[PDB]
Design a protein around this ligand. Structure first.
Ligand SMILES: CCCCCCSC[C@H](NC(=O)CC[C@H]([NH3+])C(=O)O)C(=O)NCC(=O)O
Ligand SMILES: CCCCCCSC[C@H](NC(=O)CC[C@H]([NH3+])C(=O)O)C(=O)NCC(=O)O
Lengths: 219, 207
């Protein structure tokens, strides 16, 4: 079992939870709750750059979201059939990462900038990101983003579609193929399981969860 | 067939690609975005997936996103390790590199009232977090390269960053002998030595 070291929160570990679950991989979690928990991880040499996320997997102690995700996707054949498909996957998911990052950091936005930043995220979703992925899907008409088979790109995108829905459910309304992809991926047995109550899937981060993490870093 | 790099005539988010291609001895062309109307043509022509540069035309693709570009180039030219686990170490290393790189990249854009405090935090992380981390990797095996005893993208990305740290503060590397030794070795590899010489596609600091 892979062991995920993070707070009991989405943050920078949630995409890994999604990917592992989608891949049908059982995993364990060790939740950081105190500064002492982080002290131990840091002191035991568990964190290369003294940060989490960190995943213990196949004898490695992997930090950096992308190192973790790239390893898991390759292992479970969700990173395409070759270098060219991996390139398309990388391009798609890094756009997904860019949008993901804006939403992720939204609750730490300066209050006086919050209105404008939300308006910008929504604008970008409407005009930049959703059209881009809608375009890819219409280009080949296939059930999956790349190579006509399930890959990390479908998983990463659909995870993001759930977050966009949380933000504003109307944003996906003019994108039928994204909606269709959301439905298809959500019905894959592993993902259907992950979306159901009782799975390691984390709730939206509230102020309390945010502050507990800050206190743990003693910021 | 020759890769074409679409970006401003500047380092920015394209410089690490220029470094990697040059290090791999791969000939490329650049098309410089000189104005807002240049960028709009690329967008309107459907050249940019997310309406952003960098973009590299390579092997029938219009690859946007720095990491997609670099990941493809590294694999194509055997600078991405031999197996899944070596790629994991490489990714871990270069993502730490990309994090520090990002702080230095954005420092000129930092609001003037926050500039001094941002710089102090960057220097503190270099001396206490990042440099020790890579010094440790080098010391762990005593080999000339970060991964697999063989030139990889990790060496190229790190040494590029060492150059930027030097520009920022030449004293920062002083207590890390192995990083100093890596910088020297990589800078003297034929392809990289040529890239560091005048008249190469290597770009200057922003003025
Ligand atoms: C609501 C805001 C969400 C912000 C996410 C914070 S994740 C915690 C943070 N880790 C990172 O920023 C790691 C980033 C790294 N690039 C990665 O992707 O793994 C940390 O350990 N920080 C401690 C430190 O840097 O000292
Ligand atoms: C001082 C140097 C700081 C970096 C300069 C910005 S690079 C230009 C910018 N590109 C990006 O932000 C691409 C980011 C993307 N995540 C990547 O890695 O390629 C752009 O095309 N912007 C246009 C847009 O987003 O519409």
């Amino acid at each position: 079992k892979p062991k995920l070291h993070y707070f009991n929160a989405r943050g920078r570990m949630e995409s890994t939870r999604w990917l592992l679950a989608a891949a049908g991989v059982e995993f364990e979690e060790k939740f950081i709750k105190s500064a002492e928990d982080l002290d131990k991880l840091r002191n035991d040499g568990y964190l290369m750059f003294q940060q989490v996320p960190m995943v213990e997997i196949d004898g490695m102690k992997l930090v950096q979201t992308r190192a973790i995700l790239n390893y898991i996707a390759s292992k479970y054949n969700l990173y395409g059939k070759d270098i060219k498909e991996r390139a398309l996957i990388d391009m798609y998911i890094e756009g997904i990462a860019d949008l993901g990052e804006m939403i992720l950091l939204l609750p730490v936005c300066p209050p006086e900038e919050k209105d404008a930043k939300l308006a910008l995220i929504k604008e970008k979703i409407k005009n930049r990101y959703f059209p881009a992925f809608e375009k890819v899907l219409k280009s080949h008409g296939q059930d999956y983003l790349v190579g006509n088979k399930l890959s990390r790109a479908d998983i990463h995108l659909v995870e993001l579609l759930y977050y966009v829905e949380e933000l504003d459910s109307s944003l996906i309304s003019s994108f039928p193929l994204l909606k269709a992809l959301k439905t298809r991926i959500s019905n894959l047995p592993t993902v259907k399981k992950f979306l159901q109550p009782g799975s390691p899937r984390k709730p939206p981060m509230d102020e309390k969860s945010l502050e507990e993490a800050r206190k743990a870093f003693r910021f």
